[PDB]
Write an enzyme that holds these catalytic residues in place. Structure first.
Site, PDB file in Angstrom:
ATOM      1  N   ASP A  34     -81.390 -91.859   8.927  1.00  0.00           N
ATOM      2  CA  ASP A  34     -80.988 -91.427   7.364  1.00  0.00           C
ATOM      3  C   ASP A  34     -82.388 -91.419   6.560  1.00  0.00           C
ATOM      4  O   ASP A  34     -82.887 -91.891   6.452  1.00  0.00           O
ATOM      5  CB  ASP A  34     -79.898 -92.893   7.024  1.00  0.00           C
ATOM      6  CG  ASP A  34     -79.539 -92.769   5.870  1.00  0.00           C
ATOM      7  OD1 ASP A  34     -79.867 -91.660   5.147  1.00  0.00           O
ATOM      8  OD2 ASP A  34     -79.609 -94.018   4.606  1.00  0.00           O
ATOM      9  N   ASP A 220     -80.661 -84.887   2.729  1.00  0.00           N
ATOM     10  CA  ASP A 220     -80.730 -86.331   3.324  1.00  0.00           C
ATOM     11  C   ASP A 220     -78.773 -86.254   4.789  1.00  0.00           C
ATOM     12  O   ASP A 220     -78.384 -85.382   4.045  1.00  0.00           O
ATOM     13  CB  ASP A 220     -79.516 -86.844   2.327  1.00  0.00           C
ATOM     14  CG  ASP A 220     -78.532 -88.328   2.883  1.00  0.00           C
ATOM     15  OD1 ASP A 220     -79.189 -88.674   3.490  1.00  0.00           O
ATOM     16  OD2 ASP A 220     -77.645 -88.549   1.897  1.00  0.00           O
TER      17      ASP A 220
END
Ligand SMILES: Cc1ccc(C)c(OC[C@@H](O)CN2CCOCC2)c1
EC number: 3.4.23.46
Length: 377
Positions: A34, A220
């Site tokens: 992440d 992201d």
């Protein structure tokens, strides 16, 4: 870096995970990659969705920090107990680091039923670490305690099962074609960048580029979609709609309130435009652009039990938090998070899904004036 090639796995929609070990002796866990967060957090109790979880009682090297963490988000949360322990990446560099671990003891809508991961590796910067920026992110600990160069790169493929590579500390030239173009990291909190222009099919939205980055634009790997601020999404979609009037689609579809379905192999992609983001370059008044296909924003929805057809989602959506360049964007490219020089590199991925017509492209230099004014203060 061939040791690290193909070290990521996943299922469509459920994110990309890497194998990690925690504590002594090693506890193997699959951990979500992440770049939109900064906490290393792992399941530490037998939640029924979980294949595995961190058993601290088993680890000689575990040390309790006697402090908790509570991480809320929209409709859900996780929370846990902070500690440190020894951490390795089997298909990563040949090091072991003492890292902060958030032992997840309670959660709501965090873990995915049917998923094969049990934790999350936040790769962004301390600024957005919870509970505060004194809690050192993993990658910071890794760089500090070893001679691993301060960068990583991601090739997210997604073919069902998805695959990819996270090359830690370097760049593998086999994962890309053409040249790498770099965009400055505006600030070290999220992986924040500046979009300076947007073209649908070649034509631009003609809006105050300041909008494009209201209040953020970020890279992201934990988000599936290309998110776009309210007003940018409006204009974005308005134009994609006009590019695509050949066929009619409901309003909900564009809002991701409904899926669209065609018959098996019966949806030539050309009723949809290519989409190009121009990013801020390394040099005053110089930009570059990244171009993705509708195979990137038209993502097959894995399995719908009440159908049998080619039902894709529309992978673009609104945001109050800003533009989010997620897997829709990232899967077209090899992406280099060059932390040492505060920049992110984009190049055409050796694994992106191309056809015989169009392709994902990274091109420059372009001349764009007032790129600074595109960033919100
Ligand atoms: C797997 C999972 C579960 C719950 C949440 C909240 C997740 O978010 C991952 C983050 O990277 C979300 N991004 C969204 C855009 O802004 C940065 C954070 C993932």
């Amino acid at each position: 870096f061939v040791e690290m090639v193909d070290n990521l796995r996943g299922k469509s929609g459920q994110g990309y995970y890497v194998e990690m070990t925690v504590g002594s002796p090693p506890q193997t866990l699959n951990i979500l990659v992440d770049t939109g967060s900064s906490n290393f957090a792992v399941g530490a109790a037998p939640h029924p969705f979980l294949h595995r979880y961190y058993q601290r009682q088993l680890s000689s090297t575990y040390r309790d920090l006697r402090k908790g963490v509570y991480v809320p988000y929209t409709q859900g949360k996780w929370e846990g107990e902070l500690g440190t322990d020894l951490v390795s990446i089997p298909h990563g560099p040949n090091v072991t680091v003492r890292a902060n671990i958030a032992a997840i003891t309670e959660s709501d809508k965090f873990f995915i039923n049917g998923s094969n991961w049990e934790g999350i590796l936040g790769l962004a910067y301390a600024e957005i670490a919870r509970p505060d920026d004194s809690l050192e992110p993993f990658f910071d600990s890794l760089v500090k305690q070893t001679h691993v160069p301060n960068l990583f790169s991601l090739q997210l493929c997604g073919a069902a099962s998805v695959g990819g590579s996270m090359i830690i500390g370097g760049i593998d030239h086999s994962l890309y074609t053409g040249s790498l173009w770099y965009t400055p990291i505006r600030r070290e909190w999220y992986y924040e960048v500046i979009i300076v222009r947007v073209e649908i099919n070649g034509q631009d939205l003609k809006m105050d580029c300041k909008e494009y980055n209201y209040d953020k634009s970020i890279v992201d790997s934990g988000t599936t979609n290309l998110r776009l601020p309210k007003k940018v999404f409006e204009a974005a979609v308005k134009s994609i709609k006009a590019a695509s009037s050949t066929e009619k689609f409901p309003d909900g579809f564009w809002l991701g309130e409904q899926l669209v379905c065609w018959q098996a192999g019966t949806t030539p992609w050309n009723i949809f435009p290519v989409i190009s983001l121009y990013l801020m370059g390394e040099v005053t008044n110089q930009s570059f652009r990244i171009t993705i296909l509708p195979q990137q924003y038209l993502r097959p929805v894995e399995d719908v039990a009440t159908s049998q057809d080619d039902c894709y989602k529309f992978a673009i959506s609104q945001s109050s938090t800003g533009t989010v360049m997620g897997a829709v964007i990232m899967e077209g490219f090899y992406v280099v998070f060059d932390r040492a020089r505060k920049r992110i590199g984009f190049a055409v991925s050796a694994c992106h899904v191309h056809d015989e017509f169009r392709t994902a492209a990274v091109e420059g230099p372009f001349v764009t004036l007032d790129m600074e004014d595109c960033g919100y203060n």
